Design an enzyme around this catalytic site. Structure first.
Site: not given
Length: 338
Positions: A273-274
């Site tokens: 994800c980030k």
């Protein structure tokens, strides 16, 4: 909060664990050592542990090293901790791990020992901002560690410390294996690197070689789009975009879609994800509760031990709530295959 609350607890006839609120008093046949300033947790926010897989390993090595030395065979070893409740929980966390892993104790027997002196340890918090909604206790971490042993998730015989410590660093990709040979969690890559100071942003390329040599055949992006899927697919990796709101929970459609992919991937899967903490850890946790029938708290502990900071805020409530369902699904799964 006072040296009146000091306490010594025997672990083995030679190994002792102490919570000293004052100056450790010496003795000619007693060796004292503390790890409060040697194996420190790197906090994101209010979280304060548990310590990661590596520090656990380092500790277990320091113990065996100290017990083996011929310079202190006739001395008792005391791992002492200080007046910081946070430091106390982690220190107790390490003795507990050592009992489970190297000694042949059970999670409950190890917990029983650690609380025998009647010490009250504060449970591990998450990395969210403000008020926590779920806590994982030492016992939870002990069950997690136990099962990891029974399931080959943890094997200090093969564990590579230098490799683990190398890739967790942001400058090296900031990645961690959750399930050896099966799952990797890492920081979302940006289209075009920027390792050139300021930040340590990586492009999809810096991961390609590592991924192939460690049989990664699938990649899942839960984050928004910072690079084109082509850069991964052009290297033979099957890619997927199961995106869902940052810091939010995944719908059941996403979870069933995530589980599907993983179940059919033909090797290791790399998820991101980030930051590869919140959304990433949440879905990997789901896979684990479903296939290894571990509890939300057992699973969340294992993950944070591997990659500290995973699962955040609402995500914790999500897993806890879904547990019974994933357990049941995994039940049908295993049976249909039989």
């Amino acid at each position: 909060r006072d040296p009146q609350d000091d306490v010594y607890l025997d672990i083995t006839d030679r190994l002792c664990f102490a919570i000293l609120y004052s100056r450790p008093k010496s003795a000619s046949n007693v060796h004292y050592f503390s790890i409060d300033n040697e194996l420190e947790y790197e906090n994101f926010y209010a979280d304060f542990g548990p310590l990661n897989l590596a520090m656990v390993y380092r500790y277990c090595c320091k113990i065996n090293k100290k017990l083996k030395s011929i310079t202190m065979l006739r001395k008792k070893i005391v791992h002492f901790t200080g007046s910081d409740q946070r430091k106390q929980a982690n220190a107790a966390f390490l003795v507990g791990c050592y009992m489970v892993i190297y000694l042949g104790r059970t999670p409950e027997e190890a917990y029983r020992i650690l609380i025998f002196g009647e010490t009250s340890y504060i449970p591990f918090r998450d990395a969210a901002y403000g008020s926590c909604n779920f806590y994982i206790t030492l016992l939870d971490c002990f069950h997690a560690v136990k099962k990891a042993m029974q399931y080959g998730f943890l094997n200090f015989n093969s564990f590579n410390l230098d490799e683990y410590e190398h890739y967790e660093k942001a400058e090296n990709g900031d990645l961690n294996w959750i399930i050896p040979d099966r799952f990797i969690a890492f920081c979302g890559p940006h289209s075009r690197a920027r390792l050139e100071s300021g930040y340590h942003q990586h492009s999809p390329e810096t991961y390609i070689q590592y991924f192939k040599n460690h049989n990664v055949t699938t990649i899942i992006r839960l984050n928004k789009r910072m690079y084109d899927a082509k850069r991964f697919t052009d290297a033979g990796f099957d890619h997927h975009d199961l995106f869902f709101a940052d810091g939010s929970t995944p719908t059941d459609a996403i979870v069933k879609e995530f589980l599907d992919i993983c179940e059919n991937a033909e090797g290791a899967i790399a998820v991101h994800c980030k930051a590869g903490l919140g959304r990433t850890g949440t879905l990997i946790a789901c896979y684990i509760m479903k296939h290894y029938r571990m509890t939300a708290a057992e699973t969340i502990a294992w993950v944070r031990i591997c990659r500290p900071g995973s699962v955040i805020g609402p995500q914790q409530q999500f897993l806890v709530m879904k547990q019974t369902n994933l357990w049941l699904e995994g039940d049908y799964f295993r049976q249909k295959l039989k």
